């Protein structure tokens, strides 16, 4: 957070 991680 605040950015999110990819799968």
């Amino acid at each position, epitope marked *: *957070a*605040p950015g*999110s991680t990819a*799968p």
Partner: single-chain antibody
Amino acid sequence: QVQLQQSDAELVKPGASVKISCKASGYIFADHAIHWVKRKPEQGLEWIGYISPGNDDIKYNEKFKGKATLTADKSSSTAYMQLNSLTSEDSAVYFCKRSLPGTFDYWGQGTTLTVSGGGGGSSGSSDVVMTQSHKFMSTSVGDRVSITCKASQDVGTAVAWYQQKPGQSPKLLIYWASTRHTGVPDRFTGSGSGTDFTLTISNVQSEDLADYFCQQYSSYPLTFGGGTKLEMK
């Protein structure tokens, strides 16, 4: 076709445990974390934790460590929250929801827990506090409404706004301080950065009378404002 279907209302004795389920459908279960949120009647939302089933990452709000346990069953695409050692202070509506605020935001319908001193957790002195100055606000149809949220520290632009109507789940309006979520009417705008954030409703309508909540997702634990109930003058 995205769905988060929670289990039925629970009525238990102090000292018991409960396990609330959140069945996910219509997307790849592994590709999004499921968060859990506690709502007490008339009172603010609190973030419990997330489970990220794709990488088995679990993160708790320190306040709920020793009270909540999150698991996920990939075989059933179901997330579970077990609450242990229950007291009246645990009586609330619990939501599961998908992802951080942004395009994948989606909420379960909520599960009411009803439980038939000072053993609950406390917030950290380090946690961000989100202050909505007005718990109640009055307007007239066609007026401009401004709802403000002050953060206790710089949260950059990682702020969201939610609407909630009685018996319904929160609905994302704004994220990244100023970005309107898909489907939200043009009249809802967001502004702000650092410590000051505002949701503006231009040309307000009767369908807009509801509770509004800000949330910061700058840092864990994720924290919500106390809410503003917007009503008719």
